[PDB]
Amino acid sequence: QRKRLAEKYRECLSNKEKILKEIEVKKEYLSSLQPRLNSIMQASVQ
Amino acid sequence: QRKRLAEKYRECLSNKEKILKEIEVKKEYLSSLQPRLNSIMQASLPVQ
């Protein structure tokens, strides 16, 4: 049981690192999207 | 009275010419803004 809990805790650490990687990259993507939106607004009679 | 009627007819013709110039300006503005919106969308699609 201590083996199972240690391995599952290492798997949860890897999943938390993946969630953080998703989030970091996701945040960067969101920032890029915001810049694109700003560019579109600048491009934008009406 | 005939001179005043001729002046009123000239003012009405000037108002009709101004309305025709405004309609032509609106048509030219739409025709220019069509390709301008096309270029703006083509510029926005590269940024997207």
From Swiss-Prot, chain B:
Top-rank taxon, per record: Eukaryota
Phenotype upon changing residue 29 to F: Impairs mRNA binding, enhances CXCL12-dependent cell migration
Phosphotyrosine carried by residues: 29
Name assigned to this protein: THO complex subunit 5
Function summary: Component of the THO subcomplex of the TREX complex which is thought to couple mRNA transcription, processing and nuclear export, and which specifically associates with spliced mRNA and not with unspliced pre-mRNA. Plays a key structural role in the oligomerization of the THO-DDX39B complex. Regulates the expression of myeloid transcription factors CEBPA, CEBPB and GAB2 by enhancing the levels of phosphatidylinositol 3,4,5-trisphosphate. May be involved in the differentiation of granulocytes and adipocytes. Essential for hematopoietic primitive cell survival and plays an integral role in monocytic development.
Subunit structure: Component of the THO subcomplex, which is composed of THOC1, THOC2, THOC3, THOC5, THOC6 and THOC7. The THO subcomplex interacts with DDX39B to form the THO-DDX39B complex which multimerizes into a 28-subunit tetrameric assembly. Component of the transcription/export (TREX) complex at least composed of ALYREF/THOC4, DDX39B, SARNP/CIP29, CHTOP and the THO subcomplex; in the complex interacts with THOC1, THOC2, THOC5, THOC6 and THOC7; forms a coiled-coil dimer with THOC7; together with THOC6 and THOC7, plays a key structural role in oligomerization of the THO-DDX39B complex.
Originating gene: THOC5
Residues of the full protein shown: 197 to 244 of 683
Tissue: Ubiquitously expressed.
Post-translational modification: Phosphorylated on tyrosine upon binding to activated CSF1R; which causes a dissociation of the two proteins. Phosphorylation at Tyr-29 modulates mRNA binding.
Family that this chain belongs to: Belongs to the THOC5 family.
Compartments where located: Nucleus; Cytoplasm
Organism: Homo sapiens (Human)
